[PDB]
Design a protein around this ligand. Structure first.
Ligand SMILES: *Cc1c(COP(=O)(O)O)cnc(C)c1O
Ligand SMILES: *Cc1c(COP(=O)(O)O)cnc(C)c1O
Lengths: 387, 387
């Protein structure tokens, strides 16, 4: 009755596999929040998060919940009843931002486009100019539709218009370029279990003086005590204000998981994600499958494969897991039954996984009488791995 | 540049040392939230939490957050602006409950007594009858003061007056008796890094149909999306609502930590916490030191030792740490400089740690001069272990 779990090959958009070097560190005996060993770990983790987010911000630190708690914590700390919040939505995660904003009493201005595509930044900028929102909140990369949004012009427009540009980089941080200072992002929130390959359940964040200034003004309480950044900043600085018992093991794992990213090198790691995305694409293509969505804003780290006429996609996903231990994602909501989503993130983004997922998917589709030519998919991925 | 950390002897009231069986399991490769392997771990964890809390409640499951995010999610889900909430406060964590409740728009009625004592339940029950609150929120064991509060008479009055009795059992669960059905507790929240000896960063909760019907009536939604128990209940049952990525590794750890408590036996485990408490106590006494606080309501898992006049309590704590790797807690706020708090919780509650903490504290107190005698401390703890 000790735990017994299968070894999966995980090719969803998250949570993804964790590097063995992060796994092994989690068996390390704990130290307390106020132990000098712990404060040294905290401090180094903040420095690594500044390089990771490509920022000089004084404020780069983790919060103890999932990705969404991190997003909630930022938005809660900068929204007051009736502030205008502009939110451009092109996928499922844009609606989470609106749910959060509205819950904290914001007047929410939304824009929407066709799932599968992205906005012209110009349409967002014009709306910024028109409404003069306090906050523009946006998803960098929507795993629901597989698109990644250009953010630089939008950031520069928030800064000229004196808006705070708040970004959910949960699915992109550690996998796709995210440049907080260059794109004039005012606060960014990441997550651990996607491209960083750290166990789910912590949310690294960063924000600049413009965001901190607004937080310091809070005059009326931030509604969530646990998500109060004015007390979280006292935690993550010399005061060591006893706000909550930071998560010991999870901090050890984040520390290691970010060290590994920086060892790889950011640009090298980005280019490495694109390389495996290319091998996957060529296999899927040779297999006779089509990709969903606008190919010019394709998120590098998620691939959206169209489910063919007359095949049950749930049945394919379930056989893949039950027979091969291979996990990919369906869609629930507007794209339900239209696509599978194959993630290539973090430790899961490697040659052995890309090859196993194509072999797996080919075998399961031939079993469901998909019209494929057997053997083409793997040859096309191996061609990219050799070349 | 890999993590390197000292091995501490942790004798604070949290976070404490983790059983090695829980540690080794955190190196297991992750599976996803929607993988049957993970739903199987979910379901067994919920059964075990029913036993841990001594309840039949359908609702017993962790939320991803420190203990006080657990507390916040329960209070958020049950409080609408202007609800009356009675909070009897006898230590520091009583004020966190009032903070959270006020922030959610409650009209808070507080009672406050002297730190180091508890209420006569008849005074509380009289305020219940008078205020007729929707909710009574209370701490079971205040580690800040070392007092544990009787709960049964209070829960019985809450049930007859049709108030919800919501209990912070964070410091007591798995260490001291908690009987949620018997004491007519409507909602209880635990934490992991205390008597459970699970890495901090999750909060096991339980609640009954009285609590669940108020959550279902939510008309005005709960302000926190992440702490929305109404969505968290669809997460932790048949429909598998995608509310958040459960924290994979922290769930492994909770599962194993609760399994170990249940293998020990709740009553055996509570008696084992008493045994070590008694040995620590005879050691502290024979050392010529005094305990703070009302002996009739002493929390079994914390022991508050009076700092003798002319001894810098911080200097003593720092030296124990720096030389012996032994960690004890100071107090901040009203008890600052009056007491050290020595925790005997979970895996830290063991004869080796009890012996080492007395040996270390004896040598340090002698170094600070130190009107104590000898090997009296150890012989007296050894006498109790021998009997
Ligand atoms: C220590 C403690 C807490 C703290 O919980 P965190 O995991 O630090 O959020 C809350 N309530 C009580 C009684 C405590 O002793
Ligand atoms: C997965 C995801 C989130 C939130 O993730 P959780 O860790 O499950 O709370 C937010 N934004 C994007 C784009 C995501 O993919």
């Amino acid at each position: 009755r000790e735990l017994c779990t299968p070894l999966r090959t995980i090719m969803t958009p998250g949570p993804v596999e964790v590097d063995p070097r992060v796994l092994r560190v989690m068996s390390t005996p704990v130290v307390g929040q106020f132990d000098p060993a712990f404060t040294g770990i905290m401090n180094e983790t903040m420095e690594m998060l500044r390089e990771l987010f490509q920022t000089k911000n004084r404020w780069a630190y983790p919060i103890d919940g999932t990705s969404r708690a991190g997003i909630e914590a930022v938005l809660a700390s900068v929204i007051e009843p009736e502030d205008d919040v502009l939110i451009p939505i092109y996928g499922r995660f844009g609606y989470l931002l609106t749910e959060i904003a509205e819950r904290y009493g914001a007047n929410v201005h939304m824009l929407e486009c066709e799932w599968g595509t992205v906005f012209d930044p110009e349409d967002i900028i014009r709306e910024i100019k028109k409404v003069k929102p306090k906050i523009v909140a946006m998803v960098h990369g929507e795993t629901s539709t597989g698109r990644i949004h250009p953010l630089k012009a939008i950031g520069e427009a928030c800064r000229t218009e004196d808006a705070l540009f708040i970004v959910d980089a949960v699915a992109t941080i550690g996998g796709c370029e995210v440049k907080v200072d260059e794109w004039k992002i005012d606060a960014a929130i990441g997550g651990t279990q996607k491209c960083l390959s750290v166990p789910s359940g912590m949310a690294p964040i960063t924000y600049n003086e413009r965001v901190a200034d607004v937080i310091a003004a809070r005059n009326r309480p931030i509604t969530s005590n646990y998500f109060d950044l004015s007390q979280l900043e006292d935690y993550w600085s010399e005061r060591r204000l006893n706000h909550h018992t930071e998560a010991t093991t999870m901090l050890y794992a984040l520390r290691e998981g970010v060290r590994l990213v920086l060892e790889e090198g950011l640009e090298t790691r980005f280019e490495r994600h694109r390389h495996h995305e290319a091998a996957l694409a060529a296999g899927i293509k040779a297999m006779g499958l089509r990709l969903f969505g606008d190919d010019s804003c394709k998120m590098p780290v998620v691939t959206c494969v169209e489910i063919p006429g007359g095949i049950d996609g749930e049945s394919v996903r379930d056989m893949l897991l039950a027979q091969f231990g291979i996990e990919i994602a369906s869609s629930f909501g507007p794209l339900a039954g239209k696509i599978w989503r194959i993630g290539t993130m973090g430790y899961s983004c490697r040659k052995e996984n890309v090859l196993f997922v194509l072999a797996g998917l080919e075998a399961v589709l031939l079993r469901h009488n998909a019209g494929i030519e057997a053997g083409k998919a793997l040859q096309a991925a191996l061609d990219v791995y050799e070349n």
